[PDB]
């Protein structure tokens, strides 16, 4: 027969695919993009004052930060209703914002004795081993006294420069602008951001009851030890009161069905290990079902963990005059999104197993399968020279171009050169002699000498496969 | 006199490079 095995496995997979696609449509709503877009435009893309033109994403000094804090920040947080604050007359600001500072201590570094006279004090780069832990300034409140990470319920962040801690000098702002302005003015008067500060975070969250969807906001400016300011931002639209409407019940049923399907796939894949052939891993169609099963199990575990610890919401709802600590849920939401996206991609890729219904598709599948070894053999020789070029660019230009500032940036810049996106208008001034040589030689040796070998291999293999299957038919 | 310093979050590249070369020259050999 053999028709009752290749067709049952198809029908038991199409249901899995439609369930997964239903969940995917359920996650990504169209009411999410505009929410984030309006919030981002309100907070990042407005000038700090009517006179200056520097918005948040173009901070260049520590004094501009103080213009932003008492300025376009308070101008966006607190709105007068037409007491509580509704940010767009729709989004409710729940709780109070928090501002936290990370700083180091003088004498963490050593200045050489030769020039020790002119240099008085030095502050090292940020590291947990050299982090200040002593009171400073007027030791009255909680903004001048170190507090441990466990006493803030904080966690690391992995910023652009370093991986900052969760402990520091924090201060909770007020529910009304007339008090937050006074608090920030008091902070500015007695210098709170001196030369020793290394990072400064601002956190708050909103609700927008029209569509049940929270949104947590984090704003980070980090001052490196070499001077300057590096701003960063993050807006995450969570959803924590999910079971409200009928569609939510339908999605819950879909998740339960997905869990049953994953259990079925686990048992029907472990049945083909000990009952049948073992170490059959030279197939690529059974090395892909294990990936799907593992990723789905990880996603189920992550979802259970991130929905089984929601005590922060109830704790905040009991007393609604404190800072709502939603910064942990917004991390697991990101991880869940990444895992779900990768799992969906691999499930969609798995469809290639079931398209061989005629000769014109079997020929293409065989052509793809027979040239994989040759392509893998050439890809190593291609990528060795690719990485040699990347490291050469990193060492030569990697200080003054920005596009080659790190190894990953070099790799992506070279890929964009292959696409023909970037032009060498800025490479030349970085180095007069090696500017044009690198560009022209890279293009010459990676655009029509080593890039055409893939085309040659693929064309030759396709011609050979078609010739062989034609000659096979020429004996009937 | 065994100690547990762990005083830095940085990485030393000389030891890593030396070990990597001493292992690749064994694999190919
Ligand atoms: C920090 O310590 C150095 C000595 O290592 C001292 O010269 C400097 O004045 C100190 N900084 C402040 C703000 O007191
Ligand atoms: C702490 O803040 C209070 C606020 O009134 C004020 O007395 C002063 O600025 C600081 N120092 C002390 C000792 O209170
Ligand atoms: C940390 O969480 C506890 C609840 O486990 C809470 O009582 C405490 O206030 C939180 N820390 C801060 C600084 O709010």
Tokens 């065994």 label which residue? B2
Ligand 3, residue A323: give the atom nearest the CA. 14
**Most informative mutation of A137, A140, A171 for ligand 2 (most atoms within 8 A of CB):** A140
The first and second tokens of residue A467, run together, are: 């010739």
Long-range CB contacts for residues A137-142, cutoff 8 Å, separation at least 24: A137/A190, A137/A191, A137/A192, A138/A190, A141/A171, A142/A169, A142/A170, A142/A171
Cα(A101) to centroid(ligand 2), Å: 20
The first and second tokens of residue A192, run together, are: 């709170």
Q: Report the candidate in A2, A10, A4, A8 with the shortest Cα–Cα distance to residue A353.
A: A10
- State yes or no: A419 annotated in a binding site: yes
Q: Are A324 and A371 in contact (CB under 8 A)?
A: no
Overall size of chain B counted in residues: 29
Q: What is the stated resolution of the deposited model, in angstroms?
A: 3.3
Long-range CB contacts for residues A208-211, cutoff 8 Å, separation at least 24: A208/A35, A208/A90, A208/A91, A208/A92, A209/A92, A210/A90, A211/A31, A211/A35
Whether A110 contacts chain B with CB within 8 A = no
How many contacts, defined by CB atoms under 8 Å, are there between A and B?
7
Whether A128 contacts chain B with CB within 8 A = yes
Q: Are A244 and A250 in contact (CB under 8 A)?
A: no
The first and second tokens of residue A62, run together, are: 């520590």
Q: Are A238 and A332 in contact (CB under 8 A)?
A: no
Point out the ligand nearest to the CA of residue A196: 1
CA distance A438 to A424: 10
Q: Are A432 and A326 in contact (CB under 8 A)?
A: no
Mutation to test the B interface, candidates A108, A127, A165, A225, most B Cβ within 10 Å: A127
What lies within 8 Å, CB to CB, of A10 at 6+ separation is A354
- Which DSSP symbol is given to A86? B
What lies within 8 Å, CB to CB, of A22 at 6+ separation is A251, A254
> What b/e string do you get for A417-433 counting C-beta neighbours within 10 Å, with b at 16 or more?
beeeebeeeebeebeee
Tell how many helices (H) and how many strands (E) occur in chain A: 16, 5
Ligand 2, residue A190: give the atom nearest the CA. 9
Residue A168 has phi, psi (to 5 degrees) of: 170, -160
- State yes or no: A400 annotated in a binding site: no
The first and second tokens of residue A31, run together, are: 């009411």
Long-range CB contacts for residues A4-9, cutoff 8 Å, separation at least 24: A6/A354, A9/A354
Q: Report the candidate in A290, A257, A258, A298 with the shortest Cα–Cα distance to residue A272.
A: A290
The first and second tokens of residue A366, run together, are: 């065989």
Point out the ligand nearest to the CA of residue A314: 3
């Amino acid at each position: 027969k053999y028709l009752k095995s290749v067709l049952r496995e198809l029908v038991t997979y199409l249901l899995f695919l439609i369930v997964l696609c239903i969940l995917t449509y359920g996650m990504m709503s169209s009411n999410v993009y505009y929410y984030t877009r309006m919030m981002s435009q309100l907070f990042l893309d407005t000038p700090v004052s009517k006179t200056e033109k520097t918005n948040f994403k173009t901070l260049s000094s520590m004094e501009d930060f103080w213009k932003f804090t008492e300025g376009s920040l308070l101008d966006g947080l607190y709105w007068k209703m037409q007491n509580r604050s509704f940010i767009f007359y729709e989004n409710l600001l729940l709780g109070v914002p928090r501002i936290r500072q990370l700083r180091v201590r003088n004498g963490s570094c050593s200045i050489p004795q030769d020039l020790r006279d002119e240099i008085k004090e030095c502050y090292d780069v940020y590291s947990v081993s050299s982090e200040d832990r002593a009171p400073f300034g007027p030791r009255n409140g909680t903004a001048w006294i170190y507090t441990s990470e466990k006493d803030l319920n904080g966690s690391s962040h992995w910023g652009i420069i370093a991986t900052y801690s969760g402990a520091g000098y924090y201060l909770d702002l007020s529910r009304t602008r007339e008090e937050t302005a006074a608090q920030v003015a008091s902070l500015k008067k007695n210098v709170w951001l001196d030369r020793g500060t290394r990072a400064t975070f601002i956190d708050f969250s909103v609700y927008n009851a029209n569509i049940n969807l929270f949104c947590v906001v984090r704003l980070l400016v980090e001052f490196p030890a070499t001077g300057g300011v590096i701003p960063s931002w993050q807006f995450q639209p969570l959803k924590l009161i999910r079971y409200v409407t009928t569609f939510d019940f339908f999605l819950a049923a879909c998740e339960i069905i997905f869990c049953f399907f994953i259990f079925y796939y686990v048992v029907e894949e472990i049945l083909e290990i000990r009952i049948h052939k073992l170490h059959y891993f030279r197939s690529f169609w059974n090395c892909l079902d294990v990936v799907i099963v593992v990723l789905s199990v990880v996603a189920i575990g992550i979802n259970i963990y991130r929905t089984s610890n929601v005590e922060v919401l109830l704790q905040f709802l009991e007393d609604q005059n404190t800072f709502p600590n939603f910064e942990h849920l917004a991390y697991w939401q990101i991880q869940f999104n990444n895992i779900a996206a990768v799992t969906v991609f691999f499930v969609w890729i798995k469809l290639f197993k079931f398209i061989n219904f005629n000769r014109t598709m079997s020929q293409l599948s065989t052509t793809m399968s027979r040239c994989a070894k040759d392509l893998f053999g050439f890809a190593i020789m291609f990528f060795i020279i690719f990485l040699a070029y990347a490291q050469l660019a990193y060492l030569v230009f990697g200080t003054q171009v920005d596009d080659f500032s790190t190894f990953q940036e070099c790799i992506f810049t070279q890929f964009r050169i292959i696409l023909g996106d970037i032009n060498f208008a800025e490479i030349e001034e970085a180095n007069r002699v090696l500017g044009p040589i690198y560009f022209t030689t890279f293009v010459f040796f990676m655009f029509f000498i080593l890039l055409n070998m893939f085309l040659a291999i693929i064309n030759d293999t396709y011609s050979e496969v078609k010739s062989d299957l034609a000659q096979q038919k020429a004996e009937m | 006199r065994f100690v547990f310093p762990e005083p830095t979050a940085d990485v030393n590249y000389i030891v890593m490079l030396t070990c990597a070369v001493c292992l690749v020259t064994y694999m190919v050999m």
